[PDB]
Protein backbone atom coordinates (compact mmCIF):
# COMPACT_ATOMS: atom_id res chain seq x y z
CA UNK A 1 0.00 0.00 0.00
CA UNK A 2 0.98 3.64 0.41
CA UNK A 3 4.23 4.32 2.33
CA UNK A 4 2.56 7.50 3.58
CA UNK A 5 -0.27 5.26 4.86
CA UNK A 6 2.41 3.21 6.64
CA UNK A 7 3.70 6.51 8.10
CA UNK A 8 0.11 7.22 9.23
CA UNK A 9 -0.11 3.78 10.89
CA UNK A 10 3.20 4.29 12.71
CA UNK A 11 2.02 7.80 13.58
CA UNK A 12 -1.17 6.55 15.26
CA UNK A 13 0.97 3.87 16.90
CA UNK A 14 3.43 6.41 18.35
CA UNK A 15 0.56 8.72 19.44
CA UNK A 16 -0.99 5.97 21.54
CA UNK A 17 2.45 4.64 22.67
CA UNK A 18 3.69 7.94 23.96
CA UNK A 19 0.40 9.53 25.01
CA UNK A 20 -2.04 6.83 26.21
CA UNK A 21 -2.21 3.83 28.50
CA UNK A 22 -0.80 0.44 27.67
CA UNK A 23 -4.22 -1.18 27.21
CA UNK A 24 -5.02 1.43 24.53
CA UNK A 25 -1.61 0.72 22.96
CA UNK A 26 -2.28 -3.03 22.90
CA UNK A 27 -5.81 -2.60 21.49
CA UNK A 28 -4.71 -0.31 18.66
CA UNK A 29 -1.63 -2.42 17.90
CA UNK A 30 -3.81 -5.54 17.70
CA UNK A 31 -6.31 -3.89 15.35
CA UNK A 32 -3.54 -2.54 13.14
CA UNK A 33 -1.58 -5.82 13.11
CA UNK A 34 -4.83 -7.55 12.25
CA UNK A 35 -7.83 -5.89 10.56
CA UNK A 36 -11.48 -5.29 11.60
CA UNK A 37 -12.39 -7.38 14.63
CA UNK A 38 -15.31 -9.00 16.26
CA UNK A 39 -15.24 -8.39 20.00
CA UNK A 40 -15.28 -12.13 20.78
CA UNK A 41 -12.20 -12.77 18.68
CA UNK A 42 -10.33 -9.90 20.36
CA UNK A 43 -11.42 -11.17 23.79
CA UNK A 44 -10.03 -14.58 22.83
CA UNK A 45 -6.77 -13.10 21.52
CA UNK A 46 -6.10 -10.96 24.58
CA UNK A 47 -8.01 -13.14 27.14
CA UNK A 48 -9.64 -10.09 28.71
CA UNK A 49 -13.01 -8.97 30.07
CA UNK A 50 -15.65 -6.63 28.68
CA UNK A 51 -15.36 -4.60 31.90
CA UNK A 52 -11.75 -3.89 30.96
CA UNK A 53 -12.72 -3.45 27.28
CA UNK A 54 -15.33 -0.78 28.12
CA UNK A 55 -13.43 2.40 29.13
CA UNK A 56 -10.83 1.85 26.39
CA UNK A 57 -13.50 1.72 23.67
CA UNK A 58 -15.27 4.68 25.32
CA UNK A 59 -12.15 6.88 25.35
CA UNK A 60 -11.37 5.89 21.76
CA UNK A 61 -14.91 7.05 20.92
CA UNK A 62 -14.21 10.25 22.86
CA UNK A 63 -11.09 11.08 20.86
CA UNK A 64 -12.99 10.17 17.62
CA UNK A 65 -10.51 7.46 16.65
CA UNK A 66 -12.18 4.05 16.27
CA UNK A 67 -14.99 3.78 13.73
CA UNK A 68 -17.31 1.05 15.00
CA UNK A 69 -19.35 -1.08 12.62
CA UNK A 70 -22.62 -2.87 13.41
CA UNK A 71 -24.08 -5.50 11.07
CA UNK A 72 -25.73 -8.90 11.46
CA UNK A 73 -24.45 -12.12 9.90
CA UNK A 74 -25.78 -8.70 15.22
CA UNK A 75 -22.00 -8.64 15.00
CA UNK A 76 -19.81 -5.80 16.25
CA UNK A 77 -16.87 -4.60 14.15
CA UNK A 78 -14.26 -1.87 14.57
CA UNK A 79 -12.09 0.14 12.19
CA UNK A 80 -10.73 3.70 11.91
CA UNK A 81 -11.95 6.40 9.55
CA UNK A 82 -8.74 7.97 8.24
CA UNK A 83 -9.92 11.60 7.64
CA UNK A 84 -11.92 11.57 10.89
CA UNK A 85 -8.80 10.43 12.74
CA UNK A 86 -6.58 12.95 10.91
CA UNK A 87 -8.93 15.89 11.51
CA UNK A 88 -9.51 14.86 15.14
Amino acid sequence: DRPIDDIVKNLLKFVVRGFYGGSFVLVLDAILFHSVLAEDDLKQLLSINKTELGPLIARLRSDRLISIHKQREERVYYYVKYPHAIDA
Partner: protein, 160 residues
Amino acid sequence: IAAAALQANQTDISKSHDSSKLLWATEYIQKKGKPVLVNELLDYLSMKKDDKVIELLKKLDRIEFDPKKGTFKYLSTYDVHSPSELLKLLRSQVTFKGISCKDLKDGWPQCDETINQLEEDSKILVLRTKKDKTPRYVWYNSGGNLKCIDEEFVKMWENV
Protein backbone atom coordinates in the same frame (compact mmCIF):
# COMPACT_ATOMS: atom_id res chain seq x y z
CA ILE B 1 10.22 -49.74 61.34
CA ALA B 2 9.37 -46.95 58.88
CA ALA B 3 11.13 -48.93 56.14
CA ALA B 4 9.08 -51.97 57.20
CA ALA B 5 5.87 -49.92 56.87
CA LEU B 6 7.01 -48.58 53.48
CA GLN B 7 7.85 -52.09 52.24
CA ALA B 8 4.47 -53.36 53.45
CA ASN B 9 2.68 -50.47 51.71
CA GLN B 10 4.86 -50.80 48.57
CA THR B 11 2.23 -51.70 45.98
CA ASP B 12 3.42 -53.92 43.13
CA ILE B 13 3.45 -52.03 39.84
CA SER B 14 1.23 -54.72 38.26
CA LYS B 15 -1.68 -52.35 38.85
CA SER B 16 -5.28 -52.43 37.70
CA HIS B 17 -4.41 -49.78 35.10
CA ASP B 18 -1.13 -49.13 33.30
CA SER B 19 -1.74 -45.37 33.46
CA SER B 20 -0.70 -45.22 37.13
CA LYS B 21 2.60 -46.87 36.20
CA LEU B 22 2.93 -44.40 33.32
CA LEU B 23 2.18 -41.46 35.63
CA TRP B 24 4.75 -42.66 38.17
CA ALA B 25 7.29 -43.11 35.38
CA THR B 26 6.64 -39.60 34.04
CA GLU B 27 6.88 -38.20 37.58
CA TYR B 28 10.25 -39.91 38.09
CA ILE B 29 11.37 -38.65 34.67
CA GLN B 30 10.18 -35.09 35.42
CA LYS B 31 11.83 -34.90 38.86
CA LYS B 32 15.27 -35.52 37.26
CA GLY B 33 16.48 -32.83 34.87
CA LYS B 34 18.98 -35.16 33.18
CA PRO B 35 18.20 -37.95 30.72
CA VAL B 36 17.97 -41.33 32.43
CA LEU B 37 18.67 -44.76 30.99
CA VAL B 38 16.40 -47.79 30.66
CA ASN B 39 17.87 -49.36 33.84
CA GLU B 40 16.29 -46.59 35.93
CA LEU B 41 12.90 -47.68 34.58
CA LEU B 42 13.69 -51.37 35.10
CA ASP B 43 14.66 -50.64 38.71
CA TYR B 44 11.64 -48.34 39.21
CA LEU B 45 8.87 -50.59 37.90
CA SER B 46 9.06 -54.40 37.94
CA MET B 47 9.29 -54.64 34.15
CA LYS B 48 12.37 -55.72 32.22
CA LYS B 49 12.01 -56.22 28.46
CA ASP B 50 11.01 -53.56 25.95
CA ASP B 51 7.31 -53.77 26.79
CA LYS B 52 4.24 -52.00 25.45
CA VAL B 53 5.03 -49.56 28.30
CA ILE B 54 8.49 -48.86 26.83
CA GLU B 55 7.12 -48.71 23.27
CA LEU B 56 4.38 -46.24 24.24
CA LEU B 57 7.01 -44.31 26.22
CA LYS B 58 9.08 -44.08 23.04
CA LYS B 59 5.92 -42.99 21.22
CA LEU B 60 5.27 -40.37 23.92
CA ASP B 61 5.90 -36.79 22.83
CA ARG B 62 7.34 -35.61 26.16
CA ILE B 63 9.77 -38.56 26.27
CA GLU B 64 12.78 -38.62 23.95
CA PHE B 65 13.95 -42.09 22.98
CA ASP B 66 17.68 -42.24 22.44
CA PRO B 67 19.06 -44.34 19.57
CA LYS B 68 22.51 -43.52 21.01
CA LYS B 69 22.26 -45.01 24.51
CA GLY B 70 18.57 -45.45 25.36
CA THR B 71 18.51 -42.34 27.57
CA PHE B 72 14.95 -41.18 28.24
CA LYS B 73 14.44 -37.51 29.08
CA TYR B 74 11.54 -35.18 29.68
CA LEU B 75 10.65 -32.84 26.82
CA SER B 76 9.35 -29.39 27.73
CA THR B 77 7.06 -27.29 25.55
CA TYR B 78 9.35 -24.24 25.58
CA ASP B 79 12.98 -25.00 24.74
CA VAL B 80 14.10 -21.55 25.90
CA HIS B 81 16.42 -21.14 28.88
CA SER B 82 18.07 -17.83 27.95
CA PRO B 83 16.82 -14.26 27.51
CA SER B 84 18.40 -14.22 24.01
CA GLU B 85 16.34 -17.28 23.05
CA LEU B 86 13.26 -15.68 24.65
CA LEU B 87 13.78 -12.46 22.67
CA LYS B 88 14.31 -14.45 19.46
CA LEU B 89 11.12 -16.42 20.17
CA LEU B 90 9.27 -13.15 20.76
CA ARG B 91 10.68 -11.76 17.51
CA SER B 92 9.60 -14.93 15.68
CA GLN B 93 5.97 -14.59 16.83
CA VAL B 94 3.70 -15.11 13.83
CA THR B 95 0.48 -14.20 15.68
CA PHE B 96 -0.21 -11.87 18.61
CA LYS B 97 -1.39 -14.65 20.92
CA GLY B 98 0.14 -14.32 24.35
CA ILE B 99 2.40 -17.01 25.74
CA SER B 100 2.01 -18.42 29.24
CA CYS B 101 4.75 -18.45 31.85
CA LYS B 102 4.00 -21.80 33.52
CA ASP B 103 5.18 -23.79 30.50
CA LEU B 104 8.13 -21.46 30.28
CA LYS B 105 8.78 -22.50 33.91
CA ASP B 106 8.74 -25.93 32.32
CA GLY B 107 12.24 -26.09 30.86
CA TRP B 108 13.40 -22.78 32.37
CA PRO B 109 12.99 -22.83 36.19
CA GLN B 110 14.07 -19.19 36.50
CA CYS B 111 12.06 -17.74 33.68
CA ASP B 112 9.63 -15.41 35.45
CA GLU B 113 12.68 -13.89 37.12
CA THR B 114 14.30 -13.12 33.71
CA ILE B 115 10.89 -11.85 32.53
CA ASN B 116 10.94 -9.35 35.43
CA GLN B 117 14.44 -8.11 34.58
CA LEU B 118 13.59 -7.81 30.87
CA GLU B 119 10.44 -5.85 31.74
CA GLU B 120 12.75 -3.71 33.88
CA ASP B 121 14.83 -3.49 30.67
CA SER B 122 11.58 -2.63 28.76
CA LYS B 123 12.21 -5.62 26.50
CA ILE B 124 8.69 -7.16 26.45
CA LEU B 125 4.96 -6.33 26.49
CA VAL B 126 3.81 -7.82 29.78
CA LEU B 127 0.30 -8.43 31.06
CA ARG B 128 0.18 -8.32 34.86
CA THR B 129 -2.45 -8.79 37.54
CA LYS B 130 -3.47 -6.17 40.09
CA LYS B 131 -3.08 -8.39 43.15
CA ASP B 132 0.60 -8.51 42.18
CA LYS B 133 2.80 -7.79 39.18
CA THR B 134 2.37 -11.17 37.51
CA PRO B 135 4.31 -12.76 34.62
CA ARG B 136 1.53 -13.84 32.27
CA TYR B 137 0.79 -13.75 28.54
CA VAL B 138 3.51 -11.53 27.07
CA TRP B 139 4.34 -10.04 23.69
CA TYR B 140 7.45 -8.72 21.96
CA ASN B 141 8.28 -5.07 22.66
CA SER B 142 7.84 -3.56 19.24
CA GLY B 143 7.14 -0.32 21.11
CA GLY B 144 9.55 2.31 22.31
CA ASN B 145 10.11 2.82 26.01
CA LEU B 146 7.45 1.24 28.20
CA LYS B 147 8.39 3.55 31.09
CA CYS B 148 8.70 6.42 28.64
CA ILE B 149 7.41 9.66 30.20
CA ASP B 150 6.60 10.53 33.83
CA GLU B 151 3.18 10.31 35.45
CA GLU B 152 2.60 14.06 35.87
CA PHE B 153 3.07 14.60 32.13
CA VAL B 154 0.79 11.58 31.54
CA LYS B 155 -1.79 13.16 33.86
CA MET B 156 -1.72 16.50 32.08
CA TRP B 157 -2.16 14.78 28.70
CA GLU B 158 -5.16 13.13 30.37
CA ASN B 159 -6.22 16.68 31.30
CA VAL B 160 -5.83 17.41 27.59
